[PDB]
Design a protein around this ligand. Structure first.
Ligand SMILES: [Mn+2]
Ligand SMILES: [Mn+2]
Ligand SMILES: [Mn+2]
Ligand SMILES: [Mn+2]
Ligand SMILES: [Mn+2]
Lengths: 437, 437
RNA sequence: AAAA
């Protein structure tokens, strides 16, 4: 009959409240979720949506009481709303975790509760989830409960509490290009993996920019219409010896011919050691069926698979579960809002690690992709997520970019990490060292 | 004697401490800056850099007391540090603004100071700077003074307290392209301005894609090497069916001819009513003297000047001073770090408004520039800065991009705003309404 | 300045 209540403060970061809730839920009879009301006149949005998500993914059910605060910036109104709305019941223990919310929410929820339950029959406890060392810290108690490895969360819960829905991703066994290149994907990927393991990555991306991209990427729907692709071919042919066609035919290294000749016969860009030039009477659907998937894969997607295959090995040696804690081609939306696409996600405990991939060696483009991955991981995983960008740049540029985009949040470990071309051969070990540390 | 001390908690956002420090400085004799020490074992960085900037730009001098904390997540270590390091002098008033720092800093600094001084009939007060409605909220006096229009800050001190240095920007009177087109820039910009205010912006940017960019953009230094340009032009001529040269001569709207003819004769892209083709007598220097500056301005730099010219008069009416509170092409670095450039900066009170500009109508490029301006205003202005991205996209893409990149921080006012092609003619009022209302 |  002795009721114990846990109190959480619902800010705009639901993850710490999920973690503290997951750890302490079994020891408490009631839960008071203190959230903000929506008042446009004071520029105050509501965190009720996060409070609902916390109730849903913690299975609080009837034990949950929602307490709205009219003004989360004004002490006088916080205290008034607390006296009016805080549950007036016989509690034998009141535990406030003051991790979330505004500063004035924290001090005045703390002191209101410590005063209302000063009777020694009622034990008051205050706790705080330290984001830097992953520890639940109790007030006036040396107790330091590390929750880094004990509390776990899957990608679906993590995105759901951050208000994202329609979560889709691919597995090692459901990778899309495995279907598009039947009976050959392993041969293609092994040939590509062998080349990257042989320090041929820079040679590969150089050939991909010139002459690959100058031939197969020049217009919006170039590879969708045989006439436009043939027109693009004739224009290049006019550049004579210096044409990309000649460099493709005459200056393509053997390891790149082997990669091209691993694709299925009906989906090869080459006829022997010569660029397949479509003739007239080639249907647009015949051209697309032969070059669309092959060009799109050779145009960057191969690197998403390569890095994913290097990570999956070492992640399975650990406790990670594919689909719940890592995956490829993550996509989701907020309601009535555009979708995003994240290359690779990894969850180490309850920390999201989003990984953005590119073969580009250009500072400007890699920089923009650096901004992109930083904003995405905070949208879907909260403000303590880590962003990793894997580029084709050399060591000097990756260190430059890392310092360029570094933002200070009070921790000593970087939340934005950049890898470059020299890390491709052992990219699995590099990620494992950076993530699990 | 009769000493009144103000206490500030130094987190990773120095701006609220600067605003509270500027507002209350004249009324307090001593200032206690409570900051964190660096300890990589507990993944805790130090905010001493911000504390030093706060002492410098508030001109506290020997009235400033630095109070270091060893562990900002540990209730006990916080109190031990407070007992041993807080000034032992007799104070008649102790005012603590608890806006910054961790939640455990806020709780245990508040309750420590409250017991030490409010128990002695000494004036103890606590305040909190509301980020959403720009109000300094007092706990005991129950006051909430709006500092929105009373506290000011300049781009130099704003960037400095956020640890940025080497701050450069251009004035209206020092705009770079005013030197490239002396005696002609006004005519050039006024002709472009008249067209954009006539809703010709969409037609202009489509012409800039084709055939302008098809003709004057290609290999690096295309417009500075006559052989590169003339060979490139001969290739376009062989595509006489869909030649950009034919489209230039025959399909160019009259308002663009007026723009092209607004340039000085030696810097026109047109020879009369057709494209100027360099003869073999034209040297590399003549070609660059005629075309290089004109093309770069028409390629998008004109839009930077246009937007800046549409707001400058309205900013001066609001008593904002150029250079301090607004400017164009802001550049700065962190120590030994790459520079950034921001097209336009604006400061309303103490909120930074960073404005990124592009004539592009493509989703992906505008999206990548959206991530960029969001991060940059965060780095140089703190977590409450506003980011505006002005694009050449239609209204549907503009609304999509806002929702795509929106991030929840607790306010009802959007801090990422996107404008599109349909906003160009009235961009001065659109910005003025978004920023100051 | 709503896990500093
Ligand atoms: Mn991708
Ligand atoms: Mn990618
Ligand atoms: Mn300088
Ligand atoms: Mn620019
Ligand atoms: Mn720009």
């Amino acid at each position: 009959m002795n009721e114990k209540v846990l109190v959480l403060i619902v800010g705009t970061n639901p993850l710490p409240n999920y973690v503290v809730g997951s750890h302490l839920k079994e020891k408490y009879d009631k839960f008071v979720l203190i959230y903000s009301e929506k008042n446009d006149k004071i520029n105050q949005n509501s965190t009720y949506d996060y409070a609902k998500k916390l109730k849903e993914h913690l299975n609080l059910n009837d034990k949950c009481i929602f307490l709205p605060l009219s003004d989360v910036s004004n002490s006088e109104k916080i205290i008034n709303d607390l006296r009016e709305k805080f549950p007036s019941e016989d509690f034998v223990e009141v535990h406030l975790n003051y991790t979330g919310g505004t500063k004035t929410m924290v001090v005045h929820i703390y002191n209101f509760l410590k005063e209302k339950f000063k009777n020694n029959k009622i034990k008051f406890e205050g706790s705080y989830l330290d984001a830097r060392d992953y520890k639940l810290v109790y007030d006036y108690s040396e107790e330091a409960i590390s929750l880094k490895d004990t509390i776990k969360i899957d990608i679906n819960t993590l995105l759901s509490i951050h208000l994202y829905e329609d979560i889709h991703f691919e597995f090692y066994d459901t990778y899309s290009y495995k279907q598009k290149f039947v009976d050959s994907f392993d041969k293609i990927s092994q040939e590509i993996e062998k080349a990257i393991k042989d320090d041929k990555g820079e040679d590969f991306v150089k050939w991909l920019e010139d002459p690959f991209r100058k031939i197969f990427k020049g217009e919006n729907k170039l590879l969708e219409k045989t006439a436009k692709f043939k027109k693009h071919i004739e224009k290049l042919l006019k550049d004579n010896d210096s044409s990309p066609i000649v460099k493709f035919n005459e200056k393509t290294p053997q390891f790149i011919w082997d990669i091209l000749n691993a694709f299925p016969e009906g989906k090869k860009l080459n006829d022997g050691q010569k660029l397949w030039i479509p003739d007239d009477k080639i249907t647009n659907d015949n051209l697309s069926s032969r070059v669309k998937d092959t060009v799109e894969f050779l145009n960057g997607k191969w690197f998403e698979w390569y890095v994913y295959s290097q990570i999956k090995s070492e992640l399975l040696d650990r406790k990670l579960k594919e689909g719940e804690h890592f995956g490829i081609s993550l996509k989701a939306q907020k309601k009535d809002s555009p979708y995003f696409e994240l290359d690779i996600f990894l969850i180490n405990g309850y920390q999201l690690i989003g990984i953005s991939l590119t073969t580009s060696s250009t500072r400007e483009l890699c920089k923009l992709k650096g901004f992109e991955v930083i904003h995405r991981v905070r949208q879907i995983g909260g403000d303590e997520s880590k962003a990793i960008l894997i580029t084709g740049m050399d060591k000097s540029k990756t260190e430059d970019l890392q310092k360029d985009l570094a933002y200070e949040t009070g921790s000593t470990q970087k939340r934005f990490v950049v890898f470059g071309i020299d890390d491709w051969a052992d990219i699995g070990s590099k990620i494992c060292e950076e993530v699990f540390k």
